[PDB]
Design a protein around this ligand. Structure first.
Ligand SMILES: O[C@@H]1[C@@H](O)[C@H](O[C@@H]2CNC[C@H](O)[C@H]2O)OC[C@H]1O
Length: 312
C-alpha cells in the first residue's frame, strides 16, 4: 500500500481523523485528509456548544461541513458527541430536573435526527466514568439526573435514529482497570436489558511508552459482550521537544495500538485525533507535552506513519 487509506481499506477496517472544517482551505491539510483516511469525525463541530449555543436554537453549519466532506470524498462519518459534561453551554448547566432532562433529550433527538442517514455511528455518551472506578464526579448530567441519564440518552438516540451504531466513549479504559471495569458492567447491563447500545469507543489518548499490555484482551472482552469496539481518538503524547528515541518509541506504540485492533475481529478501526502536530489539542491541555500525531508541524510523516502502515 502507498497510503494508510489503502492499508486500512485492505484490512477491512477504518482509519479516520478528527477534522476541523476550517482547515480544509489549507492545501496540505486537505491533501492528507483526502488521501490518507477513509473515515472522518468532527473534532468539535458536532458537540453541544457548537450545535445548540442557545436552548432550542441549533447551528449546524459547521457540523454540516464535516458531514459534506465525508460524503463528498467517500469517507465514513463518525458522530462525536451527543451527551458530554464538557463543552456544555452555561444555559444547559443553569437548568435542573425535568427542565434539564428535557433539554438533554431534545438535544439528542434534534442532533441525531439532523444527521440521520449521514452519521453512521455516534458517541452518544462520552466520559461517564471516573479514573479509579465509578461515575464521573464533575458531570452536570451525573449530578442533575443521576445514574439513569446514560440509558435515557441511548434510548432517545435510538428513537431518533433507528439504524445508527450507538456508542459509549471514554479514556483511560484501554486496559483492564477499575475504570474500564465500571464501563464493562454498564455495557453488559445494557445488553442484558435490551438498552440500545452497539459499540464502545476507546479514546486512546495515551502517553508515549505507556500502551497497556492488555489492550487487545480488554478490547476482546468488550467485543465478547456483543458489541463492536473502536479506537476513537488516538494520539500518543511525549515530553516536548521530540527527538529520535522518543519518536521511535512512539512509532512502536502506534504499531501496538493498531495491532491490538487488528487482533480483535469486532474492532472497527482506529481514528487518530487530528492529522498534524501543528493543530493537535495536546500542547494547550498538557503543558510540556505534545508531538502526539502521525504528521509533524511541517506535514512531514513521522516514524509512526510507517508503523501504522505495517500494522494494518
Ligand atoms: O480542540 C479540542 C479537542 O481536540 C478536544 O477533543 C476532546 C479530547 N478528549 C476527549 C473528547 O471526547 C474530545 O471531545 O476537546 C477540547 C477541544 O478544545
Amino acid at each position: 500500500a502507498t497510503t494508510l487509506k489503502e492499508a486500512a481499506d485492505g484490512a477491512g477496517r477504518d482509519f479516520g481523523f478528527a477534522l476541523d472544517p476550517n482547515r480544509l482551505s489549507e492545501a496540505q491539510y486537505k491533501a492528507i485528509a483526502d488521501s490518507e483516511f477513509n473515515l472522518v469525525v468532527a473534532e468539535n463541530a458536532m458537540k453541544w456548544d457548537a450545535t445548540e449555543p442557545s436552548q432550542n436554537s441549533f447551528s449546524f453549519g459547521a457540523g454540516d461541513r464535516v458531514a459534506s466532506y465525508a460524503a463528498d470524498t467517500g469517507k465514513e462519518l463518525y458522530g462525536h458527541t451527543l451527551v458530554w459534561h464538557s463543552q456544555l453551554p452555561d444555559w444547559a448547566k443553569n437548568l435542573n430536573g425535568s427542565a434539564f432532562e428535557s433539554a438533554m433529550v431534545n438535544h439528542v433527538t434534534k442532533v441525531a435526527d439532523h444527521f440521520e442517514g449521514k452519521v453512521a455511528s455516534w458517541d452518544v455518551v462520552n466520559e461517564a466514568f471516573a479514573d479509579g472506578g465509578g461515575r464521573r464526579q464533575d458531570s452536570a448530567f451525573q449530578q442533575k439526573l443521576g445514574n439513569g441519564y446514560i440509558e435515557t440518552a441511548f434510548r432517545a438516540a435510538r428513537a431518533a435514529d433507528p439504524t445508527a451504531k450507538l456508542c459509549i466513549n471514554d479514556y483511560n479504559v484501554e486496559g483492564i482497570n477499575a475504570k474500564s471495569n465500571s464501563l464493562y458492567d454498564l455495557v453488559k447491563d445494557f445488553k442484558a436489558r435490551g438498552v440500545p447500545l452497539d459499540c464502545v469507543g476507546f479514546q486512546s489518548h495515551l502517553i508515549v511508552g505507556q500502551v497497556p499490555g492488555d489492550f487487545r484482551q480488554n478490547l476482546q472482552r468488550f467485543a465478547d459482550l456483543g458489541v463492536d469496539v473502536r479506537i476513537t481518538e488516538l494520539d500518543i503524547r511525549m515530553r516536548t521537544p521530540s527527538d529520535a528515541t522518543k519518536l521511535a518509541t512512539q512509532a512502536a506504540d502506534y504499531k501496538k495500538v493498531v495491532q491490538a485492533c487488528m487482533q480483535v475481529t469486532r474492532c472497527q478501526g482506529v481514528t487518530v485525533w487530528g492529522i498534524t502536530d501543528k493543530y493537535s489539542w495536546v500542547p494547550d491541555v498538557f503543558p510540556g507535552e505534545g508531538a502526539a500525531l502521525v504528521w509533524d508541524a511541517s506535514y512531514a510523516k513521522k516514524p509512526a506513519y510507517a508503523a501504522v502502515m505495517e500494522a494494518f
